Amino acid sequence: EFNVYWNVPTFMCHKYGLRFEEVSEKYGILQNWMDKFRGEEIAILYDPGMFPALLKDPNGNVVARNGGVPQLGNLTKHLQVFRDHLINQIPDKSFPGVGVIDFESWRPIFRQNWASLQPYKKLSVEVVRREHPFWDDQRVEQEAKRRFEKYGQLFMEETLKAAKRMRPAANWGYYAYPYCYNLTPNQPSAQCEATTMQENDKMSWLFESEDVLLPSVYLRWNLTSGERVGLVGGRVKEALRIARQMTTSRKKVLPYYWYKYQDRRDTDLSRADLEATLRKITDLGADGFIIWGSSDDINTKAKCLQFREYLNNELGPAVKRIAL
């Protein structure tokens, strides 16, 4: 069984008379009734609740939403807000579709908050130093990490249990987990970075409670063709690796696929890239995939028409010939 799901925000084009009915009527992609964004097939929640995060004004001041770092946050305040969004966002109690929480503020493993997620390591260390002026470096960092990791797990595990409590027939999963960081500066080959693999085995608390693993397999233009296939492949094997060790239930691997090159959004994926990467997903044995898109790529009549053309001349057909 191999299902493809549509999570492109084409509701943005309904005002111009384009309802994308062909997504499911001709290409067999699972689509929410009436092409609504959220429905009985899929629902994505972008930053729901009041997850602790570090934001920046245009002014330039750092705002610490609900603590900034997990260890400083109000869990119960996050969960009431989360439960009230969810009620409105997915009004149907029997929703049996794929439920996706898109939470990207920080990673739950302290080591993984590199590059732009660094402020989360700094801040965590600073809180401890203010508390304990006489502690030495090593003692401080150790305790910062301990704190961030305990409460990072707590915020993630508790939100997922709330989703499951509220909508018990959905298939919940966090967008982008598990990470692999292959073809990256940290891990510059098509293989996942080795410590990430050990960290993913240590994160059984997340993968055991989710129903679906959702690795992001967006391509980059600045990669050879082999590397583009290797980008997707390494990420899906890792999900599958994790998925076959789970023990509470079957786990579905449904990778998140985008039709634009991430480093070159004006360009849609080539037909050559569509076939090789969708064949990789399918040959690896995943349960299907999810096609996503930004509302900024179809936020005008002109763009909606152009996407529609690509849908019918490239993406749809590829999806129908390979995957279905």
Swiss-Prot record:
Q: Name one GO cellular component term.
A: extracellular region
Q: Where in the cell is it found?
A: Secreted
**Enzyme class, first EC level, given as a word:** hydrolase
Q: Which cysteines are joined by disulfide bonds?
A: C13-C304, C180-C192
EC number(s) in its UniProt entry? 3.2.1.35
Keyword field: Allergen, Disulfide bond, Glycoprotein, Glycosidase, Hydrolase, Secreted, Signal, Zymogen
Q: What is its main location?
A: secreted
Q: Does the keyword Disulfide bond apply?
A: yes
Catalysed reaction per UniProt? Random hydrolysis of (1->4)-linkages between N-acetyl-beta-D-glucosamine and D-glucuronate residues in hyaluronate
Expression sites (tissue/organ)? Expressed in the venom glands of worker bees. It is also detected in the testes of drones but not in the queen-bee venom glands or in pupae.
GO BP, one annotated term: hyaluronan catabolic process
| Glycosylated residue positions | N74, N222
What post-translational changes are documented for it? N-glycosylated. Glycans found include a majority of small oligosaccharides (Man1-3GlcNAc2), most of which are either alpha 1,3-monofucosylated or alpha 1,3-(alpha 1,6-)difucosylated at the innermost GlcNAc residue, approximately 5% of high-mannose type structures, and 8% contains the terminal trisaccharide GalNAc beta 1-4[Fuc alpha 1-3]GlcNAc beta 1-in beta 1,2-linkage to the core alpha 1,3-mannosyl residue.
Which superkingdom is the protein from? Eukaryota
The catalytic site is made up of E104 (proton donor)
Q: Does the keyword Signal apply?
A: yes
Molecular function via GO:
hyalurononglucosaminidase activity
Q: Which family does it belong to?
A: Belongs to the glycosyl hydrolase 56 family.
UniProt function note:
Hydrolyzes high molecular weight hyaluronic acid to produce small oligosaccharides.
How does the record describe its quaternary structure?
Homotetramer.
Name of this protein: Hyaluronidase
> Which portion of the complete protein is shown here?
42 to 365 of 382
